[model samples]
Target: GLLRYCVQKHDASRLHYDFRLELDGTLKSWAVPKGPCLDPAVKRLAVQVEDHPLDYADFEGSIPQGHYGAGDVIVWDRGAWTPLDDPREGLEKGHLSFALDGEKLSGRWHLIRTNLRGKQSQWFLVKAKDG
Candidate 1:
């Protein structure tokens, strides 16, 4: 199946990119502090956030003051994604390998869980080596 993926550049309390992937019936989210990188040697920290409704994929605007994610938001990149492995199982096993066919980001990527202790789980979003 051709699932959806999106990256929202958000200027909240701090600047960050919200990377989201369509999984099951919701959008699996992560807050990437430095946005995505094209270099395979570079791995960005992806902090897993809450799952958003599927309709949120098209959202782009200020979240408004007093709101949860109050800040200016814009669609940085968007397109379809395909899982290289069984996504459900990969997520469960804490390693999701996938390919993104986006406007500014494409090729293989991996979301590998890290051992860092925190209120929210931490993962590494890394671009796989091109074959």
Candidate 2:
């Protein structure tokens, strides 16, 4: 709860969405099959997985074959993001905004935090209202 994340993608290997968490000592990582778009009308649902051990953010090398990440990773969009409301209040309503400046992605995007109970927190990827 003390880290921020940047949205990145490595489409070279078929379109994968990458979320790099800033802080937490390094970059927590996730590889989404479908890329994210900047349009609220378009809701991209990502299957949240395990939290990556920080340092994966600046990772820009060829993933070792046979390894989990084998394709080339690149920074898509990166910026500061935060929760739309307080989580403890359960008022952790969705609607947080983020701005990223990266090679693949730019502009602002919105993450609608969900109330689903599961291993990893669920959020909806949408285009920022200002976008």
Candidate 3:
């Protein structure tokens, strides 16, 4: 089964991308500073962030000055997401696998939470390999 998904590229001092998956009634968001890479060898750091409203999926505008995300926001991609497993369970287990079909992103991706913990929860986003 699949639902909505969004990928937003943010331009800032530390440019990064936002990867969000619709879980429950909210969008599960993650900040991929280095953005997503097609190569499985490169596991990008994905810091879990607060969930946003479903409407934010189609967001593309200037955040405005003094705002939380004070910068120009662009929709890098928007598409459907098919979870490889139960998202709720996979989320609780700190691991998730899914197939993404988007304008700038495609194929399978896996997110594995690392032991590392801090103000921000850390996860690794890796591209699934062909069998």
Candidate 4:
């Protein structure tokens, strides 16, 4: 089965992209402050966030003020993703390798968890060079 995914560009207190992947009926989320980069050599910092309802996968609108995430959101990208390995295990192991087929982004990518201590877990989103 093809898993769904999307990246929402948000203009909150700061500009950022919310990257979400469908898994186990929820949307695994990350806040990428710099958004995704196509350059294989560039890796963007992804701060893990709470899972969102599956319905939010295609959401685009303005979040009212005083809300937890008050901001303007737009669906920057949407598509399907395929995991190269057992996704659950990969996530638990803190390394997920996958491929994305989207309107503005495609090809191999990786999400690697970091060891730095913080309020939220940190990860790196890196693009893999096409073979």
lDDT by residue for model 3 (18-52), tens: 78877766788887665646667676777777787
List clashing residue pairs in candidate 3: none
lDDT of 1: 0.74
lDDT of all the models against the reference? 0.74, 0.50, 0.72, 0.71
Question: Highest TM-score: which candidate?
Answer: 3
Candidate 2 to truth, TM: 0.54
lDDT for model 4 comes to 0.71
Regarding lDDT, does 1 or 4 come out ahead?
1
Clashing pairs in 2: 26-54, 26-55, 27-54, 27-55, 39-127, 76-105, 78-100
Which model is ahead, 1 or 2, in terms of lDDT? 1
TM-score of predicted model 3? Answer: 0.77
Q: Pick the candidate with the highest lDDT.
A: 1
The regions of model 1 sitting more than 4 angstroms off are 12-14, 36-39, 60-71, 116-120
lDDT of model 2 at position 57: 53
Model 4 CA deviation exceeding 4 Å by range: 12-14, 36-41, 60-71, 116-120
Candidate 1, run of 10 with poorest lDDT: 112-121
Stretch of 10 with least lDDT, candidate 3:
114-123
TM-score of each: 0.76, 0.54, 0.77, 0.75
Q: Is candidate 1 or candidate 3 better by lDDT?
A: 1
Predicted candidate 4 versus true structure: per-residue lDDT over 25-117, tens digit per residue: 667877766554666667677777788777665666788435776777877778878887666666668878778888676677777677645
